[PDB]
Amino acid sequence: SMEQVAMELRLTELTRLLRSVLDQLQDKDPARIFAQPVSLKEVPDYLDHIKHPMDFATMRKRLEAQGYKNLHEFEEDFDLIIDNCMKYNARDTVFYRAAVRLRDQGGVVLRQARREVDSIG
Ligand code: NA
Questions:
Q1: Which DSSP category does 66 fall into?
Q2: Count of domains forming the chain
Q3: For the domain that residue 118 is a member of, what is the CATH number?
Q4: Phi-psi region of 98 (alpha: psi -120 to 50; beta: other; left: phi over 0)
């Protein structure tokens, strides 16, 4: 149907917009702390602590399958990256502090993304 096609074009355009958001967020992580999954071969105890691991490569795989239906879903995954890091790592660490700075800088990007998603429909 044409109605199905139109819904598909919309998911594609959301995907485009979320790609540009993901790129802008990931620029705020020049150390690439959040680029890849925590390896269970180097933090063997990770999954005892963190139930839903998340990282930018994992988000990118989902995005490329058009797996985010709305900005809320994408934000949930970004928040997991930050929140997981702030739990596993202590306040005094480079990791915890990198998550704080990512959250702060990412807020700006997501504020405007919400306006664009709402505005364009
Ligand atoms: Na903690």
A1: T
A2: 1
A3: 1.20.920.10
A4: alpha
